[PDB]
Amino acid sequence: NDNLEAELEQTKALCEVAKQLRKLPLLTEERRFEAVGALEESKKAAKEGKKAAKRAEAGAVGGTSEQQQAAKRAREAATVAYEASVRAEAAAMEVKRFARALDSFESEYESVFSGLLRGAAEHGGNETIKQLAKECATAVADDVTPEALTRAAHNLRGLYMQDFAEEYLQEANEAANKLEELQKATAETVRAADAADDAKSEAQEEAAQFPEI
Amino acid sequence: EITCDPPRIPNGVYRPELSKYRGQDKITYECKKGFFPEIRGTDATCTRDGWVPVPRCAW
């Protein structure tokens, strides 16, 4: 019927949304791991930078002007590495915060969309509709971008007049923003981890001329 | 020649969504997080007496 065309368009929209909701917790975990890795590297760069500044300062005691300038430079880099590690702390904290928000969102809807599909698998109007929903039982999306999340939410909202589809769009719009901020926060942790490494290296190069402890 | 109007399921979602259903046409419904169905099953059939069993999502 056009009723079967409607139901097939509707089953496809449920399938697209369900696949994105199963991918979100896997994606947030990769970001959470990445932020944790970026932060711990920034803390290793700060610890190493502090050591170099200490090797330079002990070395430059009673030293020349072009030896005392080195310790001052290794000290300034050791603090720049420390300050970048502090910025990586704050960025990773945001990653955990946006990941939590997105995990509450996935939790709210994944079982609902999965159950609606299970119904279409068992009682779908056509064998095509039942086949699409059966294939979508455990399917996961390849990726989730804020734009893919809202597109699929608007598509569902256009096919389903039920209030649920409208409330899903409202929530998916909030989650698309949280997903965009999860990616900005991950880049900021990586940027600060690189900033701390560069400073560690500047401290280590200036301290190269002095003896180790 | 039995027909039903779409079910009205506050705090729930049914499928498929059609303007009119015919006798023996089945809908399946799910409840919002925090809500549970009145009956165990999530099925409802279009009969002479409306949707049977009646779909209801309770707190």
By what method was this entry solved? X-ray
- On chain A, the residues whose CB falls within 8 A of the CB of B13 are 112, 116, 160, 162, 164-165
Q: How far apart are alpha carbons A115 and A45 in whole angstroms?
A: 49
Phi-psi region of B32 (alpha: psi -120 to 50; beta: other; left: phi over 0): beta
Q: Tokens 């901020």 map to which residue?
A: A181
Q: Does A10 touch chain B (CB under 8 A)?
A: yes
- On chain B, the residues whose CB falls within 8 A of the CB of A123 are 26, 28, 43
Tokens encoding A173? 């719009």
Give burial (CB, 10 Å; 0-12/13-18/19+) of A194.
Answer: middle
| Candidate from A3, A109, A120 with C-beta closest to B18 | A3
Q: How far apart are alpha carbons A91 and A161 in whole angstroms?
A: 40
Cα A194 from chain centroid? 17
| Candidate from B16, B29, B43 with C-beta closest to A125 | B16
Q: Does A122 touch chain B (CB under 8 A)?
A: yes
Q: How far apart are alpha carbons B29 and B45 in whole angstroms?
A: 11
Domain boundaries, chain A: 1-213
Q: How many CB pairs under 8 A join A and B?
A: 58
Q: Is A126 helix (H, G, I), strand (E, B) or coil?
A: coil
Task: Indicate the helix (H) or strand (E) that contains B4.
Answer: strand B3-4
Q: Read out DSSP for B1-59?
A: --EEPPP--TTEEEES--S-EETT-EEEEEEPTT-EESSSS-EEEEETTEEESPP-EE-
The shortest C-alpha distance from B7 to chain A (Å) reads 11
**CB B45, CB B24: distance < 8 Å:** yes
HSE-CB of A142 using CA atoms within 13 angstroms: 0
Which of B3, B15, B17 to probe the A interface (max A CBs under 10 A)?
B15
* Interchain pair B17, A162: CB under 8 A: yes
Q: How far apart are alpha carbons A146 and A181 in whole angstroms?
A: 10
* Interchain pair A116, B32: CB under 8 A: no
Q: Does A195 touch chain B (CB under 8 A)?
A: no
Q: Which residues contact B28 (CB under 8 A, 6 or more apart)?
A: A115, A116, A118, A119, A120, A122, A123, B14, B15, B42, B43, B44
Task: Indicate the residue type of A91.
Answer: A
Q: Tokens 């449920």 map to which residue?
A: A14
Q: How far apart are alpha carbons A43 and A50 in whole angstroms?
A: 11
Phi-psi region of B50 (alpha: psi -120 to 50; beta: other; left: phi over 0): left
Distances (CA, A) of A30 to A25, A96, A175: 9, 11, 17
* Interchain pair A116, B28: CB under 8 A: yes
